[PDB]
């Protein structure tokens, strides 16, 4: 289920830590499943995310905003993965055929660990035609 993908795939503990919050949204912005602390995103932020996947580098100059919070854009994967940092922590957003997978992390969890959980789920969803 969508909730299981969040609870059991995204929120799994890695090295004793887990994502602060996670969610799988339809590309329309609707929440398919989310964890307890996932922030409400603004329509314009979802629009920005989609434009950045379509035109790599769009958000880079001024930042990736999520829930009104600024994340410094860091190296991503053109049209597939957006990554950002905010203080000790950060986020990974992975695009699938029909959804957007989000993972927010805070130290001691690392960007690499967040990248793994979020991107591996996204890849499974893609192979599952989702």
From Swiss-Prot:
Q: What induces it?
A: Down-regulated by light.
Query: What GO biological process terms are annotated to this protein in UniProt?
Result: actin polymerization or depolymerization; defense response; inflorescence development; lateral root development; leaf development; unidimensional cell growth
The protein's predominant localisation is cytoplasm
Q: Quote the cellular component terms of the Gene Ontology held in the record.
A: cytoplasm; cytosol; mitochondrion; nucleolus; nucleus; phragmoplast; plasma membrane; plasmodesma
Where is it located?
A: Cytoplasm, Cytoskeleton; Cytoplasm
What InterPro entries does the entry give? PFN, PFN_euk, PFN_sf, Profilin_CS
**Top-level taxon of origin:** Eukaryota
The UniProt keywords, alphabetically, are: Actin-binding, Allergen, Cytoplasm, Cytoskeleton, Plant defense
Q: What happens when the gene is disrupted?
A: Delayed germination. In young seedlings, excessive numbers of root hairs, abnormal raised cotyledons, elongated hypocotyls, and elongated cells in the hypocotyl. Defects in rosette leaf and inflorescence development.
Q: Which residues form the signal peptide?
A: none
Q: In which tissues is it expressed?
A: Expressed at low levels roots, leaves, stems, flowers and siliques. Expressed in leaf epidermal cells, trichomes and stem epidermal cells. Detected in phloem exudates (at protein level).
**GO MF annotations, alphabetized:** actin binding
Q: What does this protein do?
A: Binds to actin monomers and regulates the organization of the actin cytoskeleton. At high concentrations, profilin prevents the polymerization of actin, whereas it enhances it at low concentrations. At low concentrations, associates with the poly-proline motif of formins to enhance actin filament elongation rate. Binds ACT1, ACT7 and ACT11 and inhibits actin polymerization. Coordinates the stochastic dynamic properties of actin filaments by modulating formin-mediated actin nucleation and assembly during axial cell expansion. Binds G-actin and poly-L-proline in vitro.
Question: Whom does it interact with, and what assembly results?
Answer: Occurs in many kinds of cells as a complex with monomeric actin in a 1:1 ratio.
What family is this?
Belongs to the profilin family.
Protein name in UniProt: Profilin-1
Organism, by scientific name, is Arabidopsis thaliana
Organismal lineage: Eukaryota, Viridiplantae, Streptophyta, Embryophyta, Tracheophyta
Q: Which gene encodes it?
A: PRF1
């Amino acid at each position: 289920s969508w909730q299981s993908y969040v609870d059991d795939h995204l929120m799994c503990d890695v090295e004793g830590n887990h994502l602060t919050a996670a969610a799988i949204l339809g590309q329309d912005g609707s929440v398919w499943a989310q964890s307890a602390k996932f922030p409400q995103l603004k329509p314009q932020e979802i629009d920005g995310i989609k434009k950045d996947f379509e035109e790599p580098g769009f958000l880079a100059p001024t930042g990736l905003f999520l829930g009104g919070e600024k994340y410094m854009v860091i190296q991503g994967e053109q049209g597939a993965v957006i990554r950002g940092k905010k203080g000790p922590g950060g986020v990974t957003i992975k695009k699938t055929n029909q959804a957007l997978v989000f993972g927010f992390y805070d130290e001691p969890m690392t960007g690499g660990q967040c990248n793994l959980v979020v991107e591996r789920l996204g890849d499974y969803l893609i192979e599952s035609e989702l």
